[PDB]
Structures are given as structure tokens and as C-alpha cells.
Amino acid sequence: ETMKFMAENRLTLTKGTAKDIIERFYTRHGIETLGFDGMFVTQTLEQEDFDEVKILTVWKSKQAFTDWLKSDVFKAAHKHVPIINNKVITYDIGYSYMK
Amino acid sequence: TMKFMAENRLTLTKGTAKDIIERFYTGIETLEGFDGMFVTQTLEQEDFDEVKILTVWKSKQAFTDWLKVRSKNEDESSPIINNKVITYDIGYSYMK
């Protein structure tokens, strides 16, 4: 039913700018109003040369994600948000256990 | 809750993710600092397969205490090319 598909926006940033970028995601622009199950914004630890922030979104299906890519909430979040690189990766969640 | 993430990233020879993956779907939820885990498979991967066992914790402490699948460079028959562990601070999270 839910938590079957995960999407990741991987951001490679100038070292030191990670906090400011992350705070930018406290305003999610209504993504929760969607097949959306949750999101995580992380910072890779022990990085010396670059900062890496990953925006992980969990959905109930790939289509939930692809439809989101086409939504107005996607546009507002993409326009709201240092970033040297920006890559998108997707995954099939084959197993999840939320306690 | 959910403020730390540990990732066990497994690079596999293209096509072997299918079987191997089910062995990670497996009493870690008994720890207080443990919040949850995800096991994923990367889509659209061209030359190799990728399995990531993600676990979320309340603190880096929980994960550390907890801690304290061989590679080819060991058993030539293993599908696992590389086995890395990455750690993260969860700056923000929202569920449901």
C-alpha cells in the first residue's frame, strides 16, 4: 500500500553551506497534501571537501512521484530552494519497518 | 526521534540484486534509539546493481552502541563488489 518507492534529490554543495540549505526545507510547500508517505533531509557526515544534502521522499508508487514532478507544489519547492551539483535517483523499497 | 541515519550501501554485479536482497529484509527494533529501516534497490542502474539498507536512529549514539555479507575480494563467488557504510544527520523529516 505505502512506502514502496523512494526518490532522492542529491545535492553536492560547497562545504559549510549545508545548514542554510536544509532549513530551506522546513517549509515543504504542501507536498503532504498528495501517495506521499514522508521525507527525510540529511547531511552526509565526515565530509571534508564538499557537503552533501539528500532530500529523500517515500511514496506508495513510482507514479505518485512522477505525478508530483508535474505538480505546482513541486514548482514552488524547486523555486524556493551553493549547489554545485544536483542529481535525482529513484528506488524500489523492497522492505520497510517503521516502529 | 529520527535524527540520525546509517546506510549500508552494497554494489552488486548487474542482475544479482533479485535474490540476495531478501536476506536483509530480516531484533534491532528492540533498541530504544532505533526508529526504523528501509531496504532499497536502485532503479535505472546501468552497469551494476545497488542495494541500500537504511536505518534511522534517534541519535548517532544509538547506532554506535548497536554496532559495538562478504565481498568478492574474500569469496570470489560473492555478487557483492563493494560494501560501504555511510552516516548522516537527519536535519528534517516528516512522515505521513
Swiss-Prot record, chain B:
Fe cation binds at residue 8. Its EC number is 1.14.99.48. Keywords: Cytoplasm, Heme, Iron, Metal-binding, Monooxygenase, Oxidoreductase. It is an enzyme of class 1 (oxidoreductase). InterPro entries: ABM_dom (IPR007138), Dimeric_a/b-barrel (IPR011008), Heme-degrading_MO (IPR050404), IsdG (IPR023953). Allows bacterial pathogens to use the host heme as an iron source. Catalyzes the oxidative degradation of the heme macrocyclic porphyrin ring to the oxo-bilirubin chromophore staphylobilin (a mixture of the linear tetrapyrroles 5-oxo-delta-bilirubin and 15-oxo-beta-bilirubin) in the presence of a suitable electron donor such as ascorbate or NADPH--cytochrome P450 reductase, with subsequent release of free iron. It is found in: Cytoplasm. It comes from Staphylococcus aureus (strain MW2). Residues 4-81 form the ABM domain. It catalyses: heme b + 5 AH2 + 4 O2 + 2 H(+) = delta-staphylobilin + Fe(2+) + formaldehyde + 5 A + 4 H2O; heme b + 5 AH2 + 4 O2 + 2 H(+) = beta-staphylobilin + Fe(2+) + formaldehyde + 5 A + 4 H2O. Belongs to the antibiotic biosynthesis monooxygenase family. Heme-degrading monooxygenase IsdG subfamily. The gene is isdG. IsdG seems to carry out oxygenation of the heme without the assistance of any of the prosthetic groups or cofactors normally associated with activation of molecular oxygen. This is Heme oxygenase (staphylobilin-producing) 1. Homodimer. Changing residue 37 to A: Slight loss of activity. Changes in heme binding. NCBIfam families: PRK13312.1. Heme binds at residues 23-28. The keyword Metal-binding applies. GO terms for biological process: heme catabolic process; iron import into cell. Pfam families: ABM (PF03992). GO terms for molecular function: heme binding; heme oxygenase (decyclizing) activity; iron ion binding. One of its GO terms (cellular component) is cytoplasm. The record marks 66 as: Transition state stabilizer. It comes from the Bacteria.
